[PDB]
């Protein structure tokens, strides 16, 4: 029925991101309290999407 | 005692080592003596030569 016609739509789509740059990449801490020995842990990174 | 402290654990911060029941029994033995003097009573079964 719509062989030669222009169809227009409004749509919902799921959100998506990709990483363009890494900002404040690595943050650190020598956690020692209430541990058998010293441990190294990586704190949250910040991402620019 | 641990049941009365449910959800709480005591540890040495320089280790991952808690304290043993030896300490708890030592506390309890002294503790029962404390109540044994708060009242002029002898609580554990024992023989007496008066």
Number of inter-chain CB pairs under 8 A, A vs B? 8
Chain A residues whose CB is inside 8 A of the B19 CB are: none
For B6, phi then psi, to 5°, come to -55, 135
For A34, left (φ over 0), alpha (ψ -120 to 50), or beta? Answer: left
Placement of tokens 């005591």 in the chain? B10
Q: Which residue of A lies nearest to B9 if distances are taken between CA atoms?
A: A34
Which of B46, B34, B16, B38 shows the shortest CA–CA distance to A33? Answer: B16
**Beta carbons within 8 Å of A26's beta carbon, 6+ residues apart:** A42, A45
User: Determination method here?
Assistant: cryo-EM
| Residue A36 contacts B where some CB pair is shorter than 8 Å | yes
């Amino acid at each position: 029925k719509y062989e030669n016609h222009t169809v227009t739509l409004k749509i919902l789509m799921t959100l998506r991101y990709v990483v363009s740059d890494i900002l404040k990449e690595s943050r650190y801490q020598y956690t020692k309290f209430n541990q058998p020995k010293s441990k190294f842990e990586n704190l949250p990174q910040k991402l620019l999407l | 005692v641990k049941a009365y402290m449910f959800g709480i654990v005591v540890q040495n911060p320089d280790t991952g080592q808690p304290m043993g029941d030896e300490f708890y029994n030592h506390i309890l033995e002294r503790a029962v003596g404390k109540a044994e003097r708060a009242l002029d009573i002898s609580i554990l079964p024992d023989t007496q030569h008066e």
